[PDB]
Symmetry: D2
Subunit: 239 residues, 4 copies
């Protein structure tokens, strides 16, 4: 039956709002030791918050060290931090592309690398990247966001092929449209016709994404590596 629960040291980057906050709150109610990074606004509830600029490898190192001094080495990393900056291809600047790449993809690398030091040594790690349906489905006007979120799949698979033998796995949770992430633009997209692409005919909730992360942080996911778990109501189905 159900394996005994283990309280893991968890770090959720960008875990102070939206999807990240739902993940942090769910993992904490699961019984884990949950820390979050933010960019200044502060941590939620009673969760341990650390400020972190995920474009700065020095800040990532110091943020991880502050977490380790508080709750011990990170066993479950949820790399949720990341921005969206949409544009038509011909209107997308170098700066708009690189900023989304640096925060969403390189930022996730910086955290995964910094986490791997103790994970490999302790022979246990769950690296959980928050991707997007856009990575493999290609939402228009997202050359930068879709590249960053597809890049997480390649990185997770390279990490898993190297380190799964040492008990360190890397997987991607790929949300579709999620209520806490809905902007004016996304809402108008739904009204215009985007729901036709979603079999479930509704947006998801942040708590639905948190439920998949809870699974991947649990004792029931030890043989899952390099997987993309879509939480999108079927939107991303294809090849």
């Amino acid at each position: 039956g159900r394996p005994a629960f283990v309280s893991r040291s968890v770090l959720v980057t960008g875990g102070n709002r939206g999807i990240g906050l739902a993940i942090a709150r769910r993992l904490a109610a699961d019984g884990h030791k949950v820390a979050v990074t933010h960019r200044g606004s502060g941590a939620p509830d009673d969760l341990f918050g650390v400020q972190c600029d995920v474009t700065d490898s020095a800040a990532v190192d110091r943020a991880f060290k502050e977490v380790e001094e508080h709750q011990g080495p990170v066993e479950v990393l949820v790399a949720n931090a990341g921005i969206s900056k949409d544009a038509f291809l011909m209107r997308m600047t170098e700066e708009r592309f690189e900023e989304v790449i640096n925060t969403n993809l390189t930022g996730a690398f910086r955290c995964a690398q910094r986490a791997s030091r103790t994970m490999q040594r302790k022979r246990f790690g769950r690296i959980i990247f928050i991707g997007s349906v856009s990575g493999m489905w290609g939402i228009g006007n997202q050359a930068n966001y879709a590249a960053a979120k597809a890049g997480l799949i390649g990185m997770a698979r390279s990490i898993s092929r190297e380190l799964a033998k040492a008990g360190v796995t890397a997987n991607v949770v790929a949300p579709g449209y999620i209520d806490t992430e809905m902007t004016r633009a996304l809402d108008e997209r739904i009204q215009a016709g985007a729901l036709d692409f979603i079999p479930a005919k509704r947006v998801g909730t942040a708590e639905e994404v948190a439920g998949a992360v809870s699974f991947l942080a649990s004792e029931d996911a030890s043989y899952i590596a390099g997987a993309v778990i879509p939480v999108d109501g079927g939107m991303g189905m294809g090849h």
Copy 2:
């Protein structure tokens, strides 16, 4: 946090041995009402067993009716029944191909269709096909088994696109090499070199597969449709 547990009416086909038995036992310990089909040897533990020849649409109908009279309409169908009959392509007979197709693919259709009658009406259904790494990875000498297990993905996605709006989802759990499913031939394959293709460098356990099925049967999987959840230690990574 964690949503309240709902005890669901569960049917696990071929749930009397190997992976199916681990699934049935896990879902029962989760708190669900679990029935299993078998081909005569009998049901395990105290689980409600029904005999069922999944090549016979009439037997599937009568098997589902016996389950419904016992525990109510099936809310979670785990289509685990299926045989393996390997051969080199040039040595594979029509009978060897069709028998694996009929039990693994058409058999899963017969159950999914028979389950959909009440699922659609009650606006809740979890159809969980047990696939295989071979469906998308192509283990050699498995023209029939890989076709049947890839076919489950197409079927699950067509079902989900039609019925996810009515709360009925279809997903695939795709195991890799699993300890209870190891034959002499598969064991010799591992010794010859098959472990090199598995990042985790070990076979999985039936209880690891059961852990993913437990997730997909749970209240944490409502926005997941048409997904392939690989339980393979990273073996199936690719495109």
Copy 3:
């Protein structure tokens, strides 16, 4: 500069009309020796026809013998035979499911199996399955057609993993909506909004599908194995 052309012995199953016709005509205009199977309608133009029902393994054997005596053993097999028979899941009968499986999936196996012995001896073979966007995208009301066309992918990959080392490869061309296959019902579906699913905003032509098959039959595809080549205007993009 470019590779010298080699005239191959080609068999196109179901090449009397639509996509199969365009494939047969293109491969013949390429310089290949093109035989076509049919069920009474005959072969197009001056091409060598053989009457063959791909649900009948004895007819497949006889058809390959006639092709071998006429133009030498088949070097490039294009398995195009097979049709859809749509229905909502709850309305789909066993017969409607199995008829589609037997023609599209098992029929393609019968032909690939019969071709395989001589391809292996000559250390050259191109097995080209004609799939569908539905295999991985899951068009609603196609539990049978999506299962069959996704099954082709698993079969192609198992065949490739077994035989690519002998120069025998299997690949899938996966058309989206194609003009010659547009029925009144599909046209009304496209008119009602299904054109929004296609980034190209138009249906494809049978000649556009034939162009992909021409490539896979050519000297420029020797290192391609287990691939799905989508000819769908972007419709199928996803995971």
Copy 4:
């Protein structure tokens, strides 16, 4: 019979040696007008060379201007520039990750973005990214290279979803192990067993990759958008 050839304005980035050289030579022998970017080594044969560092958006702009003045605006862009810099995850520095991202992923964006305005106006464009089996298969020690090459897929699909309706498509050619790219270390890895990962049991040739690019630049690929064409001997098969 077959489509009439159209001589396209082609730009191959990093076309001085290896795969890029073979692509440039093949597209020129096809009849195209082929320009090549380089960083000092020059263009092959009689082809028009432009010195361009694809990490520099100003150099990309200047390079496209030189190509436009010489042969007309780019109709077919082959984004081949970019190299690997492998390391175990724990040993990979920020610089080693970002250098690979900036050349392979951001560099391809800079070129696709700069090409896009004129392609849209003329309602014709072929953006062809050169990816890698590693993007979806995850070669170990390539967190950076797999992330960059998987990122190309997401970018190609977002571009296709946006612009395919204007006749501008983006696709990825994903080579496996190719002779011209085989270093001493890769050769020793293949010798040590990595050849078992390749069903074809051999490395590919640069000319085999060029054959796939030739197809995607041709009149036979108008309805292909967001596709990954693997040229890997079957190595990358999976999900």
